[PDB]
Design an enzyme around this catalytic site. Sequence first.
Site, mmCIF file in Angstrom:
data_model
loop_
_atom_site.group_PDB
_atom_site.id
_atom_site.type_symbol
_atom_site.label_atom_id
_atom_site.label_comp_id
_atom_site.label_asym_id
_atom_site.label_seq_id
_atom_site.Cartn_x
_atom_site.Cartn_y
_atom_site.Cartn_z
ATOM 1 N N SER A 164 0.795 -1.220 0.000
ATOM 2 C CA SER A 164 0.000 0.000 0.000
ATOM 3 C C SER A 164 0.835 1.282 0.000
ATOM 4 C CB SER A 164 -0.946 -0.041 1.202
ATOM 5 O OG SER A 164 -2.133 0.683 0.945
ATOM 6 N N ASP A 170 -8.641 -5.034 -6.258
ATOM 7 C CA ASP A 170 -8.312 -4.179 -5.120
ATOM 8 C C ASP A 170 -9.445 -3.150 -5.042
ATOM 9 O OD1 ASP A 170 -7.232 -2.136 -3.417
ATOM 10 O OD2 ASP A 170 -5.206 -2.837 -3.922
ATOM 11 N N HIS A 221 -7.112 -6.001 -1.478
ATOM 12 C CA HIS A 221 -5.978 -5.120 -1.194
ATOM 13 C C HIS A 221 -4.901 -5.814 -0.349
ATOM 14 C CE1 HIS A 221 -3.941 -1.300 -1.031
ATOM 15 N NE2 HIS A 221 -4.017 -1.221 0.285
ATOM 16 N N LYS A 222 -5.320 -6.658 0.592
ATOM 17 C CA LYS A 222 -4.368 -7.365 1.450
ATOM 18 C C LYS A 222 -4.024 -8.739 0.880
ATOM 19 C CE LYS A 222 -4.059 -4.223 4.709
ATOM 20 N NZ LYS A 222 -2.888 -3.294 4.726
#
Lengths: 256, 256
Positions: B79, B206, B234-235
């Site tokens: 990120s 994402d 996203h993770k």
Amino acid sequence: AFAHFVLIHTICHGAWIWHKLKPLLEALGHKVTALDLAASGVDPRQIEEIGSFDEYSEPLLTFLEALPPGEKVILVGESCGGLNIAIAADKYCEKIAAAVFHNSVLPDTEHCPSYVVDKLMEVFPDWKDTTYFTYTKDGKEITGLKLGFTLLRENLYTLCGPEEYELAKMLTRKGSLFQNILAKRPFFTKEGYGSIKKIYVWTDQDEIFLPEFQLWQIENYKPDKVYKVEGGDHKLQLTKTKEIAEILQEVADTYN
Amino acid sequence: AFAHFVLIHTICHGAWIWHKLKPLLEALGHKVTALDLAASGVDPRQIEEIGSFDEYSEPLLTFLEALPPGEKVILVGESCGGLNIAIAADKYCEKIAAAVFHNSVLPDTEHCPSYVVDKLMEVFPDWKDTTYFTYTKDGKEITGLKLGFTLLRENLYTLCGPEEYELAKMLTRKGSLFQNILAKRPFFTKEGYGSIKKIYVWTDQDEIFLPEFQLWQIENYKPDKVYKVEGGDHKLQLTKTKEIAEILQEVADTYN
């Protein structure tokens, strides 16, 4: 029935140890509060700022103080968390529907507050690679400790997945048993701590709080109810999360 | 081949986000270091003590400084971690075999350091229930933030298990993008940051670093290699841990 569970982690740990149990209890419809005690988890204080198990318990006491009249909770303490329960019970017994001990120390009212801790150290004197240090607070020398990674792996998270053990290595912080402070602390009272319902949960496969110790505690101060979980390890909230939730549900349906 | 991976978390997070990937990489034979940046994870500092993304990067810079001559590492930033990578690369480029961007911002050398962050805010302007505050450090007003639980659930940990999302609610701390500070910071250099090998890893699923943003970054500053992971969120180090490990292994076998 639904209850409001207050999960209390052990020394050197934080609310994070309950990351599996909290959502499971909520999936049953319960309200769950998982606190970070002083200098634990992401709490801003460092252990050197804490001078006693009572000061260490501040977040729990502050939380109970914030409960509106009539609202009761079920405290769940793991390992050394039983001491925070006793401390809280002598101040807010009327707000505690019951206390659940999870492979936890079980203080009594006939002996000094350090009694079960002194016994624990007799039963388990070698904490392997755990390191120690000393600091002074309010004129008293306190012995701090940082749990060793081998001790964590073999005796505390014995059967936990590698991803859970990793969290322990990343998040455990320096803490203290405040043993010498507990030894000089006024005894827990019969009117407060002594009056609450106590449920004792444990497994004989615990590699640190050995059977000799836990069975000794049960005989020393008779719990209102005892639940023995088969298998797992010291961290039952990780290795037997489902079983623990089932037990807590029964407690919620029994004490209010 | 084996490599020494240095995992760098994003703002408001800590080393804990890598709790699944770290042991997996070690199971492949790699050495892994997962740092807590300033005022992150269990670091003792509070965000109000930090005045810039550079100060925020202290633990990473200090770690690189400690590497003996000849020892190189592969940085992996998630990120907002790409900014810490750029900062570190302008001080220790010779110690970086390569940098892997994980659904991460990709700073460049032709525009100001805040360039990709300004673009991110254009693409994703609504951070839902995220709260903001301001504090002053070294004569500058810094905007801090605390990630909202709904934002965490829907856009960051979209497909993560409830036990992973729980960790996020329990461990995320207040942080900052230091956007206005980045805007006045000297540009990242071509000789330092510009010289390192850059591998860009992402997924089009994402929900915060949207395709428009990530594809925009790839076109803006061409990576040496691009890996697109199918699915996940996203993770990726939580939802596609295995896939990420496989990619990192390939990077270890490609750059040294």
